Amino acid sequence: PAFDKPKVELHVHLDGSIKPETILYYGRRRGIALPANTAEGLLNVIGMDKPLTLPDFLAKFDYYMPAIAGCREAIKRIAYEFVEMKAKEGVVYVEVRYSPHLLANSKVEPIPWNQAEGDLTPDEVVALVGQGLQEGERDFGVKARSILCCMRHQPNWSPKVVELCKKYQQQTVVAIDLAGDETIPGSSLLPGHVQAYQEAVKSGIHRTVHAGEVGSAEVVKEAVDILKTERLGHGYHTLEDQALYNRLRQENMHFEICPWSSYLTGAWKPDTEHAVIRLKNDQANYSLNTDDPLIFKSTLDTDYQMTKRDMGFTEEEFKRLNINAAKSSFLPEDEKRELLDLLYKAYGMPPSASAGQNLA
């Protein structure tokens, strides 16, 4: 591997990380049609080898989400399996994000994936995911927390999302996100979203927002100034605007960078220099992340190898950015200190002296 040491991942979607064998198993067990009859064939349909666009990417979910949504057993299992698989990438801490509405079949309007109304609500989805993450953390040694996504095209869901972040804050939920199609005009300003983020600020719920992935620097401004985000998902197009980038650097904004994702969605064109190179050269605050590894056919090694091979990233930079990811995590401060101590020890840095420097 490019970096065979402990890693921290902050930007990865549970519903974009499901095992193809688990999809196949539940499609068969539930009698729900899939576009292939083996895992290899599923990856041929669902996976991406070449850049498309963000909407073409988002459409991949339609192929497999029906097999998983609405099933309590499948939901808890994909959470458990998510932790097990991330252990294999050398991850020691992961925040995994998802829309609970997109896994439910009741108390969600409109009901997703052409499901009939059932008895599984978004609230119970969150309980189930938390349980699978907690059991995975216990069995596999990877600390795992969750982030609940508002979706840009459904501001009606956002009050419930922040409600659930508050309800489940001691059952792994550490933050709220906003995901979906960033091009929807004025989507950042829809009252359901704005009010959910204000309620998050009031109630001490941490905040991340997908912005600048394929949207302009103006969407990033909305995320920062209107939604009060603490981290940016992707954030590449911040660099369209040198003044905005300067102000964000000054405030130590964390950028959740997804190098291979950014190629496959067309967010980053490969005949331009990747935004992460500027962040590295400027010693900015950022993390490396897989985003949707099922669809991108990737692991964190895909992103580390790309930055190492093509962008001259060194071991020292990989250590640095994982320490920044831990510092920018949405853990309580005690668990942050514990995570940092684990990284210092793994990295051969002096743990006491490093903790003492952090007091500044």
Ligand SMILES: Nc1ncnc2c1ncn2[C@H]1C[C@H](O)[C@@H](CO)O1
């Ligand atoms: N990086 C991304 N940018 C925008 N939207 C995204 C991204 N990854 C996933 N999605 C969508 C589809 C999922 O169902 C939903 C919840 O995980 O989020």
Ligand code: NI
């Ligand atoms: Ni994402």
